[PDB]
Structures are given as structure tokens and as C-alpha cells.
């Protein structure tokens, strides 16, 4: 793979909370949407596997 996935995607929440100029920080709503999708997808994937075992019982 040449694609790097961040070990720490929480670096998107970094930055000083003090002396912030207005409009200094970029709007990263799309990044949060992407990370939410990954969490929903992985959890959805996980819920569709432990139910197959219930079927295969």
C-alpha cells in the first residue's frame, strides 16, 4: 500500500484553545464525516459477523 492511514487521527483535534484569531482554524467537518463512516462501517461489519455465528449454531 502507498496510502498512509493516520495511527493518530486525533491530531485533527490539536491546536491551542487560547488567543485564537477569528477564522484561523479550517472547517474540518468532512474529516469528521469520514472518520464517523469508518467507525460505523467497522461496527456494522462486526455486527454482521457475530450474527452469522448465531445462524451457524
* Contact positions vs another protein (CB under 8 A): 1-4, 6-28, 30-32, 34-36, 38-40, 42-43, 46-47, 50
Query: Cβ of residue 29: shortest distance to another protein, in angstroms?
Result: 10
Q: What is the DSSP letter of 9?
A: G
Query: Cβ of residue 56: shortest distance to another protein, in angstroms?
Result: 16
d(CA 51, CA 44): 11
Minimum CB distance to another protein smaller for 2 or for 55? 2
Using only C-alpha atoms, the chain has a radius of gyration, in whole angstroms, of: 18
Amino acid at each position: 500500500s502507498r496510502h498512509i492511514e493516520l495511527k493518530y487521527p486525533e491530531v485533527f483535534s490539536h491546536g491551542s484553545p487560547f488567543n485564537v484569531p477569528a477564522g484561523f482554524y479550517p472547517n474540518l467537518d468532512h474529516v469528521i464525516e469520514h472518520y464517523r463512516k469508518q467507525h460505523l462501517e467497522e461496527e456494522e461489519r462486526k455486527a454482521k459477523k457475530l450474527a452469522a455465528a448465531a445462524a451457524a449454531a
